[PDB]
Amino acid sequence: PTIGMIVPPAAGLVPADGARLYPDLPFIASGLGLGSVTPEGYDAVIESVVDHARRLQKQGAAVVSLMCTSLSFYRGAAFNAALTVAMREATGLPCTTMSTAVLNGLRALGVRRVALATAYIDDVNERLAAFLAEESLVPTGCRSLGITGVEAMARVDTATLVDLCVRAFEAAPDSDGILLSCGGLLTLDAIPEVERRLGVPVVSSSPAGFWDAVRLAGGGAKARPGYGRLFDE
């Protein structure tokens, strides 16, 4: 079953982080050309998201995921829902979003006290914490990479992301689990290393997006093994 993904950039490229989980599966992307991942224009955003969902339906997608965490959480639960309802009505397909994916992953692992490890700015981390509070999770703290530009993003490796999660956890030792939400960075290998070092499960947002969209498409394909408890499943 073909999985459709709506993405932030104009070019319409399948996200790199998570694709490794499903090497045999067909993924098609359609680019919003947003200029932001946290845009102004409540109606305009819904409108472009609808337009792009319809483009994906015409290309044979069996489901559509809005594959951007920030865009789906920055205006809280009411907006994540509005996005989902608008896509499904315009397409007749089951639709979902990366923020729903994250919720779904955290629930599957039993997490309700969640430490945040992100690459976002303060205001954005605050909106994330607010979204998760609305969904009956307790955000217990946050540590962020605090980097910008391709150069610095390029310089991130697995170790950087593992250390990030350990930091976030040390700071919030009461946490049930960790949400790694590091848009644009490669996180898969970090997941089971963090779970080993800490004994607490990790959800990574982009990989959760792939997993959740693959679940929704209901084909039964399993993620490649070795990428943490959620995906070992």
Side-chain angles (χ1 to χ4, degrees), residues 1-19 21-223 225-232:
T2 296
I3 298 163
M5 296 174 160
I6 296 171
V7 298
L13 308 180
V14 176
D17 193 42
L21 290 181
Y22 298 105
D24 306 326
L25 299 195
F27 294 109
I28 298 189
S30 186
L32 291 177
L34 265 191
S36 209
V37 173
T38 49
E40 262 154 294
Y42 185 107
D43 287 334
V45 173
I46 306 288
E47 314 293 2
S48 346
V49 168
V50 161
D51 178 1
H52 287 270
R54 291 179 141 258
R55 303 194 198 186
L56 288 169
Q57 182 278 336
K58 284 181 196 163
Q59 299 178 74
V63 294
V64 173
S65 174
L66 179 61
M67 285 284 289
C68 178
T69 331
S70 295
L71 219 205
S72 49
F73 72 70
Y74 77 120
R75 292 186 193 241
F79 191 71
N80 189 46
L83 283 164
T84 303
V85 174
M87 298 185 283
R88 189 191 62 257
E89 302 274 11
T91 62
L93 304 170
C95 301
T96 185
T97 75
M98 194 169 285
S99 287
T100 291
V102 160
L103 292 181
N104 280 349
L106 260 0
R107 298 165 177 160
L109 292 165
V111 177
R112 19 217 320 115
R113 296 188 68 83
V114 69
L116 312 183
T118 80
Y120 309 130
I121 64 171
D122 292 343
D123 191 74
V124 177
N125 294 322
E126 289 154 29
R127 290 160 179 272
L128 174 60
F131 172 83
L132 297 161
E134 279 192 281
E135 294 284 352
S136 286
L137 299 172
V138 191
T140 59
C142 182
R143 186 78 166 251
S144 303
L145 284 178
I147 62 180
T148 49
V150 243
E151 193 318 280
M153 293 282 279
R155 258 174 206 225
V156 179
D157 57 25
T158 296
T160 304
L161 294 168
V162 171
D163 290 348
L164 183 75
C165 293
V166 170
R167 254 72 273 192
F169 187 72
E170 295 175 339
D174 51 308
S175 301
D176 274 349
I178 295 168
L179 173 60
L180 181 55
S181 196
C182 270
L185 298 169
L186 268 19
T187 66
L188 281 185
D189 279 353
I191 300 175
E193 194 174 327
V194 168
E195 287 183 344
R196 198 185 62 73
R197 291 194 48 179
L198 299 174
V200 111
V202 172
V203 170
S204 182
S205 62
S206 188
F210 278 83
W211 160 85
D212 169 74
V214 169
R215 275 193 2 166
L216 230 217
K222 296 296 169 194
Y227 297 110
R229 290 132 64 159
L230 177 55
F231 301 142
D232 280 357

